[PDB]
Design a protein around this ligand. Sequence first.
Ligand SMILES: OC[C@H]1O[C@H](O[C@H]2[C@H](O)[C@@H](O)[C@@H](O)O[C@@H]2CO)[C@H](O)[C@@H](O)[C@@H]1O
Ligand SMILES: [Mg+2]
Length: 244
Amino acid sequence: MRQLLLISDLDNTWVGDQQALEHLQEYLGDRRGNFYLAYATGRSYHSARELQKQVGLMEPDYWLTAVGSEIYHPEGLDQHWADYLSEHWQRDILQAIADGFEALKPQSPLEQNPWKISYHLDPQACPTVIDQLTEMLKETGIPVQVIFSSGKDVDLLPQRSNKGNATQYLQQHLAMEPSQTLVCGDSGNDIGLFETSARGVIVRNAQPELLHWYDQWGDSRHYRAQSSHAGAILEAIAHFDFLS
Ligand SMILES: OC[C@H]1O[C@H](O[C@H]2[C@H](O)[C@@H](O)[C@@H](O)O[C@@H]2CO)[C@H](O)[C@@H](O)[C@@H]1O
Ligand SMILES: [Mg+2]
């Protein structure tokens, strides 16, 4: 029922340039009833909440955490989404395989959850290994997705997940159209957002992988901002003429 569904990652997209973050929240703060806000971050819910306290993030309507593997409504965790992602998902099997790659090191336990298996790629290892991993996991027949971002972060998620799928799920839930949705991202864990039919904005300080993606799949709904961080979101809002 609002004119805009604003979805954005936090670190180096919403957050990173304090001044830009502040004037972005000032502008939006003056028309808070005209849009739904959702943070689509790779961080866990607790880690996101912690960031909010550090930089003073404005309270969002929804939290799409751990790359969309968990969705938090004002009232709490979405159990429908969780059961949905649990169908045919085989965490143990996938983990056993991923654990077998010398080039991969598990991320801390606090970065893992039932629907997210994360690792770090060795800075000395050849990225092509990510391809070998993807192929090997897909062939198990388990609906799995491999998310590679910032040249080091690797997330194993159900196929039904990722920021984009969580976004579409949210859009349906709020009866918001893609034409009324704006996704903002900076890295490979945002590609899912741009595979969506919503309007999208790639921040100026975007990671190499996202830019490469844009070069190959960029469409007319995708905008490459001149501004970096929060500024790109204001720039995009003016570009797609949202909150007219
Ligand atoms: O999906 C990529 C990656 O995202 C999250 O990582 C954050 C990290 O917690 C931050 O402190 C900062 O460094 O930026 C990262 C990129 O957003 C997840 O926490 C991580 O597990 C995941 O792989
Ligand atoms: Mg990102």
